[PDB]
């Protein structure tokens, strides 16, 4: 699709069998989801944003389906008001910015 | 142009006639700049993201040219390490996400 930015670019994703709403975020290096259970091992990590750093759980090689397009990559899980799909998965689905 | 997401989408902007590097950021509602002492009135504002809220200075109707595409709007000045161009200006330059 082509998505404009008059509203937040929120889309539906599927992960671990569940549907969620997530923000397509070109400013985010990483994908950060709200606290949730995901299968498999995770590693404690920290990541930083506009307000400072938080602790997250790092899950590797997690399948995520984003508007029907498939990605498999690192998903971080931690305290967050919005699910954010970052460049690590946006690149996998061939997402670009155009103007 | 088309900006891919293999690296951070950093581009040149012009503000106050001077050139800066800034992140095209579809996950940002607002445009938030590194510390700079713009003339004129401003208002305090709180903005948040991962890690919490920060205090910023809000300046209105500031011209910002993004890769030669002119915009004008609100800019917030804060302690962040990178300038971010958010949807308030991305919409003005006709920027879309495409995949
Ligand atoms: C998500 C990770 C941590 C991987 N990346 C970022 O947060 C990066 C960090 C760099 C470096 C520091 C300066 C900021 C940049 C860019 N961000 C990415 C952003 O796109 C970031 C993503 C985000 C969106 C929503 C919540 C949390 C993170 N956007 C913001 O921080 C902006 C700042 C702003 N006011 O423009 N935020 C929001 O747009 C926003 C919308 C709604 C909302 C609701 C409740 C609480 C906060 C909040 N923030």
Question: Please, what are the domains in chain B?
Answer: 1-99 (2.40.70.10)
Nearest CA in chain A to B93: A99
Q: What's the rounded Cα separation, in Å, for the pair A62 and A49?
A: 22
Technique that determined the structure: X-ray
The sign of the dihedral angle between the CA atoms of B16, B55, A56, B88 is: negative
Q: Which residues contact A33 (CB under 8 A, 6 or more apart)?
A: A15, A20, A22, A75, A76, A77, A80, A83, A84
Hey, whose CA ends up nearest to atom 33 of ligand 1? B28
Query: Under an 8 A CB cutoff, do B98 and A95 touch?
Result: yes
Nearest Cα to Cα of residue A25 among B53, B29, B76, B67: B29
Q: Is the minimum CB–CB distance between A71 and chain B shorter than 8 Å?
A: no
In sequence order, the 6+-apart residues with CB closer than 8 A to the CB of A24 are A3, A9, A10, A11, A66, A85, A90, A95, B26, B27, B97
Q: What is the resolution of this structure in A?
A: 1.5
A68 — contact with chain B (CB < 8 Å)? no
Q: Which residues pair with A85 in a beta bridge?
A: A24
Smallest CA–CA distance, residue B7 to chain A, in Å, is: 8
Does the beta-carbon distance from A27 to B32 stay under 8 Å? no
To 5 degrees, how large is the angle CA B5–CA B82–CA B74?
100
Angle at A3 between CA B46 and CA A60, to 5 degrees: 75
Name the token pair of A27.
């400013």
Ordered DSSP codes for A59-73: EEEEEEEETTEEEEE
Whether the CB of A25 is below 8 Å from some CB of chain B: the reply is yes
Q: Is B67 left (phi over 0), alpha (psi -120 to 50) or beta?
A: left
Q: What single DSSP character describes residue A74? A: E
Q: How far, rounded to the nearest angstrom, does the alpha carbon of residue B82 sit from its chain's CA centroid?
A: 9
The torsion angles phi and psi of B48, rounded to 5 degrees, stand at: -130, 165
The owner of tokens 């050139």 is B19
- Measured CA distances, B71 to A34, A61, B30 (Å): 33, 40, 13
Rounded to a whole number of angstroms, the distance between the first and last alpha carbons of chain A is: 15
Contact A99 B1 (CB under 8 A): yes
- The DSSP symbol for A89 reads H
Say which residue the tokens 């503000």 belong to. Answer: B15
CB B49 within 8 A of CB B95: no
């Amino acid at each position: 699709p082509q998505i404009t930015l008059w509203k937040r670019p929120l889309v539906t994703i599927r992960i671990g069998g569940q549907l969620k709403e997530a923000l397509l975020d070109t400013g985010a290096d990483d994908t950060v989801l709200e606290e949730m259970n995901l299968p498999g091992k995770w590693k404690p990590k920290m990541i930083g944003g506009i307000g400072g750093f938080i602790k997250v759980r790092q899950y590797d090689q997690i399948p995520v389906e984003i508007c029907g397009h498939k990605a498999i990559g690192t998903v971080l899980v931690g305290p967050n008001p919005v699910n954010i799909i970052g460049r690590n998965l946006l690149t996998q689905i061939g997402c670009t910015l155009n103007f």
